[PDB]
Design a binder for this molecule. Structure first.
Ligand SMILES: CC(C)(COP(=O)(O)OP(=O)(O)OC[C@H]1O[C@@H](n2cnc3c(N)ncnc32)[C@H](O)[C@@H]1OP(=O)(O)O)[C@@H](O)C(=O)NCCC(=O)NCCS
Ligand SMILES: CC(C)(COP(=O)(O)OP(=O)(O)OC[C@H]1O[C@@H](n2cnc3c(N)ncnc32)[C@H](O)[C@@H]1OP(=O)(O)O)[C@@H](O)C(=O)NCCC(=O)NCCS
Ligand SMILES: CC(C)(COP(=O)(O)OP(=O)(O)OC[C@H]1O[C@@H](n2cnc3c(N)ncnc32)[C@H](O)[C@@H]1OP(=O)(O)O)[C@@H](O)C(=O)NCCC(=O)NCCS
Ligand SMILES: CC(C)(COP(=O)(O)OP(=O)(O)OC[C@H]1O[C@@H](n2cnc3c(N)ncnc32)[C@H](O)[C@@H]1OP(=O)(O)O)[C@@H](O)C(=O)NCCC(=O)NCCS
Ligand SMILES: Nc1ncnc2c1ncn2[C@@H]1O[C@H](COP(=O)(O)OP(=O)(O)O)[C@@H](OP(=O)(O)O)[C@H]1O
Lengths: 729, 403, 402
């Protein structure tokens, strides 16, 4: 009933009131306790006072303008508060979002126009405030974004974002275009899809254009001023309501298609969004809004939202703020990049380096090889001109920065070297030997190495202080992580330069201490090894791939093993066995190694040789090899699907814990973002480290529930699932 | 479990086709009233006040079929206002469920004479016209893992190993036996021609039949449920549960699946004392009924546990049954049922089925029941078992004995 | 042969039509909530022995389409062998579901059956399913279609029930419903509706107006004189009842059943089925009966159906301790009481649909559960439950406390 959260009973005010001689009120949001406006308790109380005043003075108010005094318009909900919400707080969470939407609903139905003056980023609750207005004007400035990214944090737009966008665009368009993926739009795209109505060049023109629109709206359309389309008697929802035969014929396919897209992964936010959108479209606006609040409280008090808020807000913020960057190092600009190797990795590194605006010299052993490496960038620009994401004159300058060559003399003037040749220590020693004296004296010597330790590779060059690991991931144009490995003789001066270069090409960096396998390759190895062990035990390969997809991985493990090449995996198992047998120990082979050698003996070592666990024809993947079931007696072992899912997730979660104990990783933030962005650990877990403190199954939640499930897995499948002592008590 | 329940009459309309069908101009209510008037013609001295209920199955009770169409039939046909009238919906088995419920009402002693059956004008009220939560509610759809019956039929053929030629072979078999039944006069007594308000003929035969079907013509047909499974993603949904199955083989087409048709059926069920008081001759006896179910994603494996339950409930085995009648929703469903219980082929759907003549959802159960009453009498056989697969993974079965 | 026993009878509170607490709750959720309550009371119940779920629903369209009973079985995670069938016999659907469940148990071919009904009239309004008797002119013209309300006013006109008479019964219903609530009679059978988060949505019958007075009821306008003069249904009814010159429109929103949302569930089984699951029988289904009367007056079906179920059980009015008749309209209850000379203190003793609402498909199972409780509370023996039905039908049931 009230615009305030409490009927009984000291927050700082965040809104400035200004009524001009025309009767136009300007609400300027300016939270003094931070650099951005956020739906905290200060905003809620401040907006409640403003809305109360708008009602009390309604006889002398002609229009309203909502504006901001920060760089951004409004950032959204308070993540620091939402991450602490417990299941017993569901009533308080529900009451908070109901109060927030009560304020916006009154603003929406004052009987007079309200205009949002969007000066910067309007995200989440920020856009929801703007959606409650009758007209939206956005400044076409740099860095401005608009969208509802709540699903990215395991949440949903609970301040009316679902209800209002469904009223604006219908169920299908709102869900696909705005809600389901949380897409962030630039002001030009926002007007194109319908989130914004008008654009201006600078932020100074917003309030004047807002007041001018109010003056024209009151004269041109006096009957519809301040009335949203859904508050008119003849409102018709675009695409129809669920009770109309047109939409009712395709509506049953929405949850199945969503389940197909998610592959059965346990991520509840998209389903909750779809349910709220459809259920809300069956009832009046206020009933729809209350339903939205109930689904919001269900997500906020759940565990997945806590996982995704931890990784995609806090962990990403700690990384993007130099959490693993050395202290007090000045920036050293980069003039020219030299990429050694024109394979898929080296060609991808050259593309993302040229797309960032750098001059790149792409060298291989032959000019024919370096040219087809540049052709990798040419095929990406052609698909970028067809879709229409870049111009011809800008795509011309991109490919012009890539200079394919086969002569080491063309590395003259290169102050940044990225090697991407075959995994071989003396090969990388030879390749760096030809080039370390032709490049600049202070040039960085980077190596895209999977497993070979950086300390050993550094001996092959003279200046070991500028030698560093710069690990990329295939395909380089789409994978956003760069695993920076610090060798023993690697200086902090070279750490910062690669850190800056990673940010310059638009990628996220993690810093890892030198060790065989580093973090990404070592952890992803336990993932594919766990699946191959299931194949050897007799589990149907179709179930193994289903367990990987329903676990949340972007690619099923047998399909991934083919891309990784089984001869690389056998080579890694040999290097691991040699280190144990040279120290006098007895090597315990992972049960997957017998499966790797079996496939190599059968001449099916992966996709490069056109035969692996799948069949390949015309370069496309056809299906699982029919001879697979006869080779491993598939079907003889039928464990429950959740056991297969947990064996894969736990193998990686446990290996992540070892990497933290051994000092490979320095922070759980790097562990989480590195596992998510590097090797594709399921995002609903929040990362392979968050998976431990946030595990939820039929046997409870928390680290203790994680250890119990690990012990249950160890009793049935092997001692490798035994939790280390750092997780016990 | 006291009063025995007997079938005294069992009639049905011909089944008119969906596209350019003869019954498209006929309201679903008129199809039922036409069958009521035929019962009066066959028993002009029947005291209708002894009829205590009219139970009609209907899977889409909306529009022309809404508002309790059974009660509408009672009032429109001038039946006594005390004759009741209730509509029920148990998906495909609604017609047999109405008969079973009528039989159970008689056995309880609290009902004497009941009209049971069903009606479905699929050309006027298409399937799904009634909405529902399992389909049109995302939270429920997501958890129940909703998958259309068609994908479940293809999934059955994939698991059991029924090839495209296997299901098409059954489709040809059904078209042949249906044509032989019509040519031999088997349906001359129970198929009641539909006439208009002036007595003019509208339809007198099962116009969905294609007697000249050949194996080559069926092989040319395209999988009718490939664009629905791909664009809807229902294949991926089904394989998330049946995770050991890599690929679904889409073998079902419009030639080996049941036809979409209009039709109605009516059965007169009563006790022995009710039949003797009205001068009715009992044609068969309801021995036992049973209802069970199976996985809802595969959906169409319900008839197997329902048949076993009605056999054990009646104290019978497969060998004791002379005729098995299973609705031909999809060819793979019948082949799966035949494989599970080792049904002799000469005893299964001996007069053809829904692939040839059509599947008017709410009426099909009563139609195939009356088919077996006639065929037991024509062969002078003793027992027949009738069953239908049901959406949502259900199953209903009934055993009748000729009297 | 086998005797049919009632083991549980529960219902949701009834939410009102305008600004109702249950408007945001899907009909399926109402049923699932009652299924979870049954599990809470019997956590060791082997659900595999439940052979069918029978739900009445008068408007099986939209949220209530597609066999909502089967939807409830699957959405609640009940065994796939538990069946699920929807039926519609208009107002008596909830009791017909119970009666059909009892007859299936008596036949021996069913052991344990869940029965009841659901109707969310605020989300799926009455008449949303269409129908020939209303929308097809040929049969509408023949069956002399007339809304139930004109028949209710016609009953008052023929029987000489004044506006004060029907308002006096309306007041009594409100008073008795309020007394039953404040007395804690409904504490165990009304199951509060909660959301996916456990938050309360509704825990009481919010249609009730316990502060009703005879003066307030006298101020209301006849709610069905606009339906009579716009559709011409007055003249249609008087063409059949040609000896009455004018219909006295006495029924209002204060003396007619309320339009509400709600659901009800009843567990019915044999003695052997209850003994195997450790269930204690609460009542026995003694007899059921269905009959009817003139479809134009539409609301005189209760009398022949009650007469028929008494004769079938070998009982008379004097043998019955409690009479429960759905309060569709005040005159319907007053005529039923006049026809059978029902003692006032035995009729609808805990209030009725005038106070608490009439959620069509569920009402029969709700008032059935009300009598199971009140027999146990009074330590009485027999109750007779009956409901008037659209189209001129009638259903009646006799239960016996165990
Ligand atoms: C607003 C944004 C786009 C740009 O921010 P920026 O200008 O780069 O500033 P920063 O990221 O350094 O953040 C600055 C401050 O704002 C805070 N902040 C920003 N958005 C916040 C939110 N939604 N909740 C809480 N605090 C928030 C940060 O925690 C930080 O506080 P601090 O400086 O005291 O540590 C970015 O902060 C962002 O992505 N916000 C998230 C919005 C969102 O997805 N909300 C979902 C729930 S509605
Ligand atoms: C998981 C989530 C929080 C963000 O995950 P994330 O951090 O992007 O995950 P990753 O670490 O794998 O990110 C690397 C990805 O960047 C992608 N990427 C970067 N630039 C890209 C571009 N221009 N085009 C396409 N993909 C691009 C890479 O392809 C890679 O995988 P992706 O294509 O599957 O996204 C978010 O995707 C989410 O929650 N989505 C909502 C649920 C959903 O998927 N709904 C859709 C149903 S239709
Ligand atoms: C399978 C189904 C989708 C087919 O729909 P349809 O394609 O519109 O049906 P048609 O009868 O037109 O068959 C398609 C084609 O096959 C042809 N065909 C069908 N049976 C044939 C036969 N025996 N011999 C030769 N041709 C045949 C038709 O003539 C038509 O040819 P055309 O389209 O080139 O003119 C539809 O019948 C269906 O949905 N049935 C399945 C059962 C169901 O949905 N519900 C039951 C639930 S238990
Ligand atoms: C009778 C009926 C038309 C009334 O509908 P309605 O006008 O929306 O009902 P309301 O209670 O909202 O309105 C009745 C008016 O009297 C008042 N009122 C109702 N009951 C009252 C009571 N006990 N004491 C005091 N005032 C009362 C209401 O507050 C309202 O006053 P208002 O109009 O100034 O707001 C409707 O309830 C109805 O049709 N019910 C019968 C069900 C039926 O048709 N068939 C059942 C199948 S058997
Ligand atoms: N979880 C499972 N994983 C692998 N195969 C399965 C699984 N469940 C059932 N099957 C297979 O399904 C077939 C029989 O199904 P079941 O009756 O076992 O299924 P059910 O477990 O649902 O009862 C068996 O294959 P076959 O025809 O080669 O004998 C069985 O191997």
């Amino acid at each position: 009933s009230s615009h305030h959260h409490h009927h009984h009973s000291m927050p700082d005010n965040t809104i400035q009131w200004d009524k001009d001689a025309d009767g136009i009120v300007t609400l300027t949001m300016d939270d003094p306790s931070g650099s951005t406006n956020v739906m905290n308790e200060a905003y809620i109380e401040s907006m409640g006072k403003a809305v109360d005043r708008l009602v009390a003075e309604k006889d002398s108010i002609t229009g309203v303008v909502v504006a901001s005094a920060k760089k951004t318009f409004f950032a959204g909900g308070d993540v620091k508060t939402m991450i602490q919400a417990r299941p017993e707080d569901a009533g308080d969470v529900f009451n908070t979002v109901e109060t927030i939407k009560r304020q916006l609903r009154t603003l929406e139905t004052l009987g007079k126009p309200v205009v949002a003056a969007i000066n910067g980023a309007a995200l989440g609750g920020g856009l929801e405030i703007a959606l409650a207005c009758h007209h939206r004007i956005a400044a076409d400035v740099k860095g401005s974004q608009l969208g509802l990214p709540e699903v990215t944090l395991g949440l949903l737009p609970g301040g009316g974002g679902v209800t209002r966008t469904v009223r604006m665009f219908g169920i299908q368009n709102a869900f696909v275009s705005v809600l389901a993926q949380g897409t962030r739009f630039k002001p030009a795209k926002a007007k194109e899809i319908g989130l914004v109505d008008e654009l201006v060049a600078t932020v100074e023109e917003l309030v004047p254009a807002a007041k001018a629109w109010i003056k024209e709206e009151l004269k041109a359309n006096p009957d519809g001023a301040g009335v949203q389309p859904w508050d008119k008697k003849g409102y018709k929802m675009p695409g129809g309501t669920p009770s109309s035969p047109g939409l009712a014929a395709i509506l049953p396919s929405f949850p199945s298609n969503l389940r197909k897209q998610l592959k059965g992964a346990p991520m509840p936010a998209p389903r909750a969004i779809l349910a709220a959108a459809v259920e809300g479209a069956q009832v009046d606006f206020d009933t729809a809004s209350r339903i939205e609040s109930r689904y919001f409280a269900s997500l906020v008090t759940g565990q997945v939202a806590k996982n995704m808020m931890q990784a995609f807000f806090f962990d990403l913020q700690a990384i993007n703020a130099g959490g693993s960057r050395p202290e007090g190092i000045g920036k050293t600009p980069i003039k020219r990049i030299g990429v050694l190797g024109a394979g898929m990795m080296g060609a991808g590194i050259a593309y993302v380096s040229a797309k960032a605006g750098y001059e790149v010299v792409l060298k291989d052993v032959s000019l024919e090889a370096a040219a087809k490496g540049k052709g990798y960038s040419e095929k990406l620009e052609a698909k970028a001109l067809e879709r229409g994401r870049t111009t011809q004159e800008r795509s011309d300058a991109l490919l012009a920065r890539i200079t394919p060559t086969a002569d080491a003399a063309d590395f003259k003037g290169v102050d940044f070297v990225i090697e991407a040749v075959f995994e071989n220590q003396e090969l990388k020693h030879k390749v760096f030997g030809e080039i370390e004296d032709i490049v600049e004296p202070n040039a960085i010597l980077g190596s895209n190495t999977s497993t070979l330790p950086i300390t050993g590779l550094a001996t092959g060059v003279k200046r070991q202080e500028d030698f560093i690991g710069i690990h990329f991931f295939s395909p380089v144009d789409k994978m956003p992580l760069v695993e920076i490995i610090k060798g023993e003789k690697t200086s902090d001066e070279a750490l910062a330069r690669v850190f800056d270069y990673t940010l310059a090409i638009g990628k996220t960096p993690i810093v890892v201490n030198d060790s065989r396998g580093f973090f990404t390759s070592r952890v992803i190895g336990t993932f594919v090894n766990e699946a191959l062990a299931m194949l050897g035990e007799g589990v149907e390969p179709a179930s193994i791939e289903q367990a990987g997809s329903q676990a949340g991985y972007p690619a099923p493990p047998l399909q991934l093993s083919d891309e990784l090449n089984l001869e690389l995996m056998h080579k890694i198992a040999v290097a691991t066995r040699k280190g144990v047998e040279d120290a006098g120990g007895t090597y315990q082979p992972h049960p997957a190694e017998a499966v790797v050698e079996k496939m190599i003996e059968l001449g099916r070592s992966g996709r490069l040789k056109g035969a692996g666990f799948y069949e390949y024809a015309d370069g496309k993947r056809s299906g699982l090899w029919p001879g697979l079931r006869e080779t491993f007696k598939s079907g003889s072992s039928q464990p429950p699907l959740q056991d297969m899912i947990d064996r894969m997730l736990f193998a990686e979660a446990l290996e992540t814990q070892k990497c933290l104990d051994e000092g490979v990783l320095t922070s759980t933030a790097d562990a989480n973002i590195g596992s998510i962005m590097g090797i594709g650990f399921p995002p609903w877990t929040g990362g392979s480290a968050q998976f431990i403190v946030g595990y939820s199954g039929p046997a409870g939640t928390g680290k203790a529930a994680f250890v119990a499930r690990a012990r249950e897995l160890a009793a049935a499948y092997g001692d490798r699932f035994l939790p280390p002592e750092s997780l016990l008590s | 479990m006291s009063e025995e329940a007997f079938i005294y009459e069992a009639i049905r309309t011909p089944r008119g086709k969906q596209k350019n069908g003869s019954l498209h101009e006929v309201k679903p209510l008129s199809l039922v009233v036409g069958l009521i008037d035929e019962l009066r013609k066959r028993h002009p001295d029947l005291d209708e006040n002894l009829i205590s209920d009219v139970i009609l199955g209907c899977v889409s009770p909306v529009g022309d079929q809404g508002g309790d169409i059974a009660r509408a039939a009672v009032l429109a046909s001038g039946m006594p206002v005390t004759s009741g009238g209730v509509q029920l919906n148990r998906f495909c088995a609604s017609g047999l469920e109405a008969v079973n419920t009528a039989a159970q009402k008689v056995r309880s002693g609290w009902d004497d004479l009941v009209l049971a059956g069903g009606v479905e004008s699929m050309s006027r009220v298409p399937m799904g016209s009634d909405g529902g939560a399992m389909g049109l509610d995302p939270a429920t759809n997501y958890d129940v893992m909703f998958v259309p019956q068609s994908i479940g039929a293809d999934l059955i053929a994939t698991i059991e190993g029924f090839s495209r030629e296997d299901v098409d072979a059954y489709a040809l078999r059904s078209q042949q036996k249906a044509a032989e039944a019509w040519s031999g006069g088997y349906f001359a007594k129970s198929v009641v021609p539909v006439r208009d308000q002036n007595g003019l003929l509208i339809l007198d035969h099962d116009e969905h039949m294609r007697p000249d079907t050949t194996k080559e013509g069926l092989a040319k047909l395209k999988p009718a449920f490939e664009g629905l499974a791909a664009l809807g993603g229902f294949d991926d949904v089904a394989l998330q549960k049946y995770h050991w199955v890599e690929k679904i083989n889409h073998v079902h087409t419009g030639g080996n699946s049941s036809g979409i048709v209009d039709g109605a059926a009516l059965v007169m069920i009563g006790s022995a004392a009710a039949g003797k008081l009205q001068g009715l001759t009992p044609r068969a006896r309801i021995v036992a009924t049973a209802t069970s179910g199976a996985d809802p994603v595969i959906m169409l494996t319900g008839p197997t546990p329902a048949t076993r339950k009605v056999l054990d409930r009646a104290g019978l085995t497969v060998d004791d049954i002379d005729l098995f009648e299973l609705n031909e929703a999809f060819a793979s469903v019948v082949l799966k049922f035949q494989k599970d219980l080792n049904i002799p082929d000469e005893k299964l759907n001996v007069n053809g089925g829904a692939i040839a003549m059509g599947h008017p959802l709410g009426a099909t159960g009563a139609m195939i029941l009356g088919t077996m009453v006639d065929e037991l009498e024509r062969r002078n056989a003793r027992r027949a078992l009738i069953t239908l697969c049901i959406g949502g993974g259900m199953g209903v079965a009934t055993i009748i004995e000729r009297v």
